[PDB]
């Protein structure tokens, strides 16, 4: 699969290909925004840059997909809503943990998934290894 990339989100997937997880930021008022877009809703500036995330966060919510089967994944699989330390949130996969062991608020850290030779994606794993 190729993500639905256009001019307003290409920067984030390009950073991901370089194994940098980034957050869009207004260059004028420095307010972060995610999901991204061309304008700052706080001050109206169209000038923006990015900050690199620390790579830390917490499970804010999650889902455990059981049925129907997804082709690209072993079932069941987990998608988490991760609240990054910087204060924005991010949907991504949560790997390395049995679904019944997930706790809301648990600390997680960034890892990188090569979804295919063309696509590298950020994913999160528990800060505490599951053995």
């Amino acid at each position: 699969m190729r993500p639905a990339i256009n001019r307003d989100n290409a920067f984030w997937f390009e950073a991901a290909k370089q194994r940098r997880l980034v957050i869009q930021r207004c260059a004028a008022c420095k307010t972060l925004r995610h999901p991204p877009g061309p304008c700052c809703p706080h001050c109206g500036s169209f000038d923006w840059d990015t900050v690199e995330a620390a790579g830390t966060g917490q499970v804010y919510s999650y889902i455990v997909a059981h049925h129907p089967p997804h082709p690209a994944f072993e079932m069941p699989y987990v998608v988490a809503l991760v609240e990054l330390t910087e204060g924005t949130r991010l949907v991504t996969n949560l790997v390395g943990i049995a679904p019944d062991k997930i706790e809301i608020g648990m600390p997680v850290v960034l890892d990188w998934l090569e979804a295919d030779p063309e696509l590298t994606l950020p994913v999160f794993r528990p800060a505490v290894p599951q053995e």
């Binding site: 639905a4 919510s61 999650y62 889902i63 059981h66 998608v79 809503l81 949907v91 809301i104 994606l121």
Partner: protein
């Protein structure tokens, strides 16, 4: 003046099935003609048509097939089933301003039997599909899990919604699950789709069409049925609204855009929650019924589970709910068939009529920009 200016005078539907055997346009035309006839009108009387952005039977194709002919009003509302009550707001607005006299709102599709550009709508999927977050059930599940965390609701609390839906559907001959009620045990035994949602938390897709005729309240008084006056009609989209995935707000366990709908409905109609005698609460998935009750003021934040467990959604309770069986039990016509049930409740003609009902609150799709109505008995004797 909008509130009370217009009324629903006609409802019309095809059979709801899993295989219509005919085109979406034919279903739209059947439902539209049925609603027109139900209002005691003729197709040439119609001068307005409203549907959803995604509906493939355009206003002009409906009009030239049915003999509606010329139109002075034709509009769409987006965001899927979020739009259902908005189509009626559109019609009421056109009537109140004199743009149109007779407006038909419709939706018809073969969602059970039927078979990306550079824009922002397409690009929104980049945050979802690469991670396998690809279905509406999963999008809803992300909210439901957090609501459980914050308020201690359980799967059985969501299941009670399914049970009452199916209880009402079981006595509704038009419902897909006519004569097939479920138990809470049935709900809990049904397979996981995406935690915390079981199979029986999720509605199935449908083939069918639904139409509604809106006229001035004065006109409706000369038509065959008790008018279902449009006392409130509202749209709502919240701060940092996304399509099913507003996961980035300070709190994600409510539905702020439904709170905004409700505030307008009560202000428009001059009513309070205590004045509402029944509710048609959009229920393509069960869990968001709970925050809907809270957003609309029927119980305190986090206490919908208690409101439901106490029996208030039952026919004999304080807030008889989804007396047709809901999207979950009757049919998934993206909320439009729920507006029709609200009309029956006002008329007194529901298959599960909970006695006399003066005011009925109807909601549209949850997780999206949405809408609502308050339909009421005619307030004559002023």
């Amino acid at each position: 003046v909008l509130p009370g200016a217009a009324a629903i005078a006609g409802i019309g539907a095809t059979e709801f099935s899993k295989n219509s055997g005919r085109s979406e346009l034919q279903l739209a035309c059947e439902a539209v003609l049925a609603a027109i006839a139900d209002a005691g009108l003729e197709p040439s009387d119609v001068d307005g048509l409203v549907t959803f952005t995604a509906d493939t039977s355009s206003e002009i194709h409906v009009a030239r097939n049915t003999g509606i002919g010329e139109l002075k009003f034709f509009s769409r509302v987006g965001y899927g089933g979020g739009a259902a009550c908005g189509t009626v707001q559109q019609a009421a607005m056109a009537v109140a301003t004199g743009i149109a006299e007779v407006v038909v709102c419709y939706r018809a599709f073969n969602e059970r039997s039927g078979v990306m550009d550079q824009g922002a709508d397409s690009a929104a999927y980049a945050w979802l599909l690469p991670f396998g977050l690809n279905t509406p059930a999963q999008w809803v599940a992300m909210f439901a899990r957090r609501y459980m965390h914050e308020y201690g609701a359980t799967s059985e609390d969501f299941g009670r919604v399914a049970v009452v839906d199916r209880k009402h559907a079981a006595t509704n001959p038009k419902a897909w699950f006519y004569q097939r009620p479920i138990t809470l045990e049935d709900h809990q035994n049904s397979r996981w789709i995406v935690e915390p949602l079981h199979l029986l938390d999720c509605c199935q897709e449908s083939d069918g069409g639904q139409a509604l005729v809106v006229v001035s309240t004065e006109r409706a008084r000369d038509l065959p049925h008790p008018p279902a006056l449009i006392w409130g009609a509202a749209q709502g989209s919240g701060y940092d609204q996304h399509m099913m995935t507003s996961y980035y707000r300070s709190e994600i366990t409510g539905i702020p855009e439904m709170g905004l709908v409700g505030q307008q409905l009560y202000a428009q109609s001059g009513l309070n929650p205590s004045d509402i005698g029944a509710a048609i609460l959009y229920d393509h998935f069960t869990p968001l019924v709970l925050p809907q009750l809270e957003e609309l003021g029927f119980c305190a934040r986090g206490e919908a589970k208690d409101f439901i467990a106490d029996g208030n959604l039952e026919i004999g309770g304080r807030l008889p709910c989804n007396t047709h069986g809901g999207q979950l039990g009757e049919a998934y016509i993206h909320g439009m068939n729920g507006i029709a049930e609200a009309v029956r409740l006002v008329r007194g003609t529901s298959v599960n009529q909970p006695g006399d009902v003066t005011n009925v609150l109807v909601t549209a799709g949850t997780g999206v920009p949405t809408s609502g109505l308050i339909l009421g008995a005619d307030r004559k004797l002023r």
